[PDB]
Design a protein around this ligand. Structure first.
Ligand SMILES: C[S@@+](CC[C@H](N)C(=O)[O-])C[C@H]1O[C@@H](n2cnc3c(N)ncnc32)[C@H](O)[C@@H]1O
Ligand SMILES: C[S@@+](CC[C@H](N)C(=O)[O-])C[C@H]1O[C@@H](n2cnc3c(N)ncnc32)[C@H](O)[C@@H]1O
Ligand SMILES: Nc1ccn([C@@H]2O[C@H](CO)[C@@H](O)[C@H]2O)c(=O)n1
Ligand SMILES: Nc1ccn([C@@H]2O[C@H](CO)[C@@H](O)[C@H]2O)c(=O)n1
Lengths: 283, 283
């Protein structure tokens, strides 16, 4: 069994007639897993901001299942639209990018394979990486790199980026990667930068914050939160939130699980993953 | 699934040909569960200081299984006796009393049903509760009550106990319970006292400390620690130990799980249980 799949689903404490949210449908792994544990009175409501994820979800032929296209920050609204306030028995969030977003160079997440410098989980709307970098001030880019990338060279990288875009506007991931490599002495030099930019383009951290906030208001008594963070910056947020809300009383923190050596050798990208689980009290 | 059984066993990350220790055999629940996941090359070594537990283990007819009668603090020695140093793939400890110890009034753990004031997990040796209380100084008893019981009234309770034993030596659990109730104003008054005395008679906290210490030396690379604490005083120890030894590098802490509302309503005594999991690194 794995932390990432088996433990995360366990965390939801599924009952057959319960009502669950998969806030990060992706390719339906968790969703299918949850559905297989639901009875005929069970209900699964799924969310994803990525159209391709919606395209997968669309094919699921189950009257108990539905999908919403939008950010999981609007979780509270979705639940209100359906008069489900206080009737959610579990919310699962499997945070970060999907494998298709990573593997399809055209989605523009990769500095390894060339593609449009995009980085949007939802390319239907909002500002792309290229546009953001094309308009942003040096100080802005620097702050993004330091805060979301933990990039020591944020200032010089931001400088080099601004200069480049002043002279020859960047449009492709490989251009960005090459500018970052050049700007830095000498892992790959552009990794943290790409993470920082991605996190900015997608508001990933604030998204998590807002979803966690709304979760308290939508959960039934005994309702579960089962949240997988991909890396430290997300996890910091999940931990802070569970800590603040369980000390005293609206939540009871039920703990935290990380993948062992075997699971990480089996799956490399699980390296920094952290599952956290909590439960809505009666307060 | 439960934290107490399913999650704890998951924590061991069992491979079919691995070598595991169940340090708290009890009635063989975990042991049977582990065995069912072992192949023909697998090995389970079990420990318990309680003869009745040995009497259960004895009936298990499996060449892969063996039982040792002694404190789990001697874990390191047992493993050395068998030339298994560095070859243990997992150690499970399910801490505290067994249900039979609780339910059999004659074992003298209960202030509800009368029995000999004993409280020994291993009645074959060591000093009983009655003997300890019969010889101990007021200040000693007081310290035990405060530290292991978190009993506010430790001083007056210790005083009353000393006086009682000076006049009419206590020999039965109900005598102790009545003395404690009388000594205190007015839950049940004797609960914390009984816990404190039990913990002293059995050295439960130091036992845990020593076993954790030896575990580092016996574990193979990737070897697991899966430890269930029954209450806060044990858990404090497990947490401290995993924290100290994973910051920097001999252990990697893999997290912590607590039972949710449902599991605690299903099982009352799981109320304060905490599962912690770790893994031996290569250091
Ligand atoms: C790590 S994948 C989850 C994969 C899924 N658990 C599975 O088994 O296939 C994360 C998914 O959540 C989506 N996502 C990430 N953040 C989101 C957000 N803030 N709002 C809506 N969807 C989001 C991504 O588009 C991606 O498809
Ligand atoms: C909570 S019961 C474990 C029950 C077991 N997990 C099962 O499934 O049946 C704890 C057992 O561990 C034993 N035990 C507790 N502390 C011990 C110690 N320090 N050394 C050896 N055995 C101990 C007790 O005698 C008791 O039988
Ligand atoms: N609608 C929007 C979207 C993005 N921004 C960008 O936010 C950054 C603030 O550090 C700056 O980089 C700024 O360009 C904005 O100002 N308005
Ligand atoms: N072999 C032993 C066993 C127990 N004790 C008891 O340990 C307590 C120290 O606070 C005191 O209560 C003391 O009686 C001891 O001194 N020697």
């Amino acid at each position: 069994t794995t932390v990432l799949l088996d433990e995360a689903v366990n965390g939801l404490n599924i009952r057959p007639d319960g009502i669950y949210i998969d806030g990060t449908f992706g390719r339906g792994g968790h969703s299918r897993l949850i559905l297989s544990q639901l009875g005929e009175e069970g209900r699964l409501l799924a969310i994803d901001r990525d159209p391709q994820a919606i395209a997968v979800a669309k094919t699921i032929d189950d009257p108990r299942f539905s999908i919403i296209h939008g950010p999981f920050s609007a979780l509270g609204e979705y639940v209100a639209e359906r008069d489900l306030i206080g009737k959610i028995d579990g919310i699962l969030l499997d945070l970060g990018v999907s494998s298709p977003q990573l593997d399809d160079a055209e989605r523009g997440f990769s500095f390894m394979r060339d593609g449009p410098l995009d980085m949007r989980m939802d390319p239907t709307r909002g500002q792309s990486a290229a546009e953001w970098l094309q308009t942003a001030e040096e100080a802005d880019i620097a702050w993004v790199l330091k805060t979301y990338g933990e990039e020591r060279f944020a200032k010089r990288i931001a400088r080099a980026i601004v200069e480049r875009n002043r002279e020859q506007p960047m449009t492709r991931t490989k251009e960005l990667a090459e500018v970052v490599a050049a700007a830095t002495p000498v892992k790959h030099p552009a990794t943290r930068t790409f993470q920082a930019v991605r996190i900015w383009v997608n508001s990933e951290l604030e998204e998590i914050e807002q979803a966690l906030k709304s979760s308290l208001n939508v959960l039934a008594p005994g309702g579960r939160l089962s949240i997988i963070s991909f890396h430290s910056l997300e996890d910091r947020i999940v931990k802070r939130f569970m800590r603040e809300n369980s000390r005293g009383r609206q939540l009871r923190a039920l703990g935290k699980l990380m993948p062992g050596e075997e699971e990480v050798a089996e799956n490399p990208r699980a390296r920094s993953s952290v599952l956290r689980i909590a439960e809505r009290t009666n307060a």
